[PDB]
Amino acid sequence: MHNYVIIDAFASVPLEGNPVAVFFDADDLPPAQMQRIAREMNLSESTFVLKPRNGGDALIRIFTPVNELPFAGHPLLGTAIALGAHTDNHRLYLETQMGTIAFELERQNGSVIAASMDQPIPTWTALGRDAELLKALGISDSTFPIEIYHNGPRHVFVGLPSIDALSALHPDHRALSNFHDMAINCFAGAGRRWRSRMFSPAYGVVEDAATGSAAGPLAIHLARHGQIEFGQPVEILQGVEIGRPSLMFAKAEGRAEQLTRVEVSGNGVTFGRGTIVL
Amino acid sequence: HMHNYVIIDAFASVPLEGNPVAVFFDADDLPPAQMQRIAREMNLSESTFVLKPRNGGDALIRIFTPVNELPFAGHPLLGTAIALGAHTDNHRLYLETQMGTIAFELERQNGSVIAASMDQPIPTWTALGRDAELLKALGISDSTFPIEIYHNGPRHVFVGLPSIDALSALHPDHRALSNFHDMAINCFAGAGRRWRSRMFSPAYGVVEDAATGSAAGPLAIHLARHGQIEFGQPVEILQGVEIGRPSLMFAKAEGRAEQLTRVEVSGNGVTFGRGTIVL
């Protein structure tokens, strides 16, 4: 039997943010069973905590309902918050398929409130499928060039001219399914405050509440396109329209040609705790 | 305030098959607005909330999809009956709903409730009359049977496919189906005692559902009305194969079209997990 907790990542109260089911003591489970368990939970991701193999504190495997990912932001944030209960550490190193991810935990009286991670530095290129993607999204143009970023998963960014226009999107889920191994992140905002919506048939979700591995790339994207400075922290509010408001904090330090750090942080809270029969 | 829950895989006899439902106990203190938000948190096809009875039943059950309340549903109530069956030695359980009281017969084996049978509300039905729209959303040109919509609380449309291969090949347009409000689209194929189904319902917050128990009774009626089976003939309906959640629903509809006397749906169910939440 395995214990799990349900963490609402990128939230300061239960029922906000983005849930992740974190399964402990998972070294006995084959990956095909981890995948089926993720399918059972039907959350954007479930994670599995394994003994470390390369000097971290734990090795974490991350599954959507349909596929394994090599890195993901909300699932790891929630995993770090949940594991932080195990010990008194304030620095935590979590192994993934993209390498070891460093976390700093915000604790009060030993109790974990939030965490900050140093993400993989993404690479990027032009999508080159603009007409097709804009048609699928139901819009004419992006406000900025349409580029795809890779940090394990892949994230495409499409800019909208207002928050109302963002909220008005009704994408064609089936047309989006022709965009394999990527998530589509639509953004709008100004200055230090941005809104997002994410859609990804490829990762098993019509609309995700908080796509943490997109937050770092968005900060880069906004700085590369002159809307914020490199190093300027931004707030990215995702999931509003679906009733799952999620507050992601991001900062990308360096310059376009040489990034030094991509920090994403958030609060997270426990929604529940239990045990599965396998 | 805190609440215990179980996860039942309905219409399955092993965990990770069937259709999960989260059943929350002692839920009277949750306003419906919070029950709705908890159903979205769980993100299963439904969560249920067990409330004290008001009309002579054992409990009153409220049923939520990730996006709306339903007055009746089959897999969620099967799972709720199995979960509550753990708490009693009784053979029968009476679950009050917005559609009235639903009677369950519980099947036990070596001290565990392993299955249950329900008598569903007798549905009404009519032709849908939106065939070109619906067939275009599904990506097909016609139905093997008249396209009819049944109501037993929720609503279920049935579209017939000429082979299981044709059913498995469907890739419906989720957005186009969202114009079909307050209903589920159930596509079926098979013969005799053995049928396959797939269900799609943006209205009820699901791209594709693994086991639509409130569609099982209506499908048995549909098949008898259209000459494919006899009234009273038990059928096996296998749903959810293509999404990796095979679910076996057993259904029988007794009487004749002008007067059905019983619409029975049964299945196995098993506990996947259990826990407690912070509100």
Ligand SMILES: Nc1c(O)cccc1C(=O)O
């Ligand atoms: N939540 C995510 C998802 O649904 C797909 C891909 C990535 C994430 C994430 O949190 O990074």
Ligand SMILES: Nc1c(O)cccc1C(=O)O
């Ligand atoms: N599972 C169901 C769903 O997803 C929508 C409506 C009804 C049901 C059901 O099990 O009856």
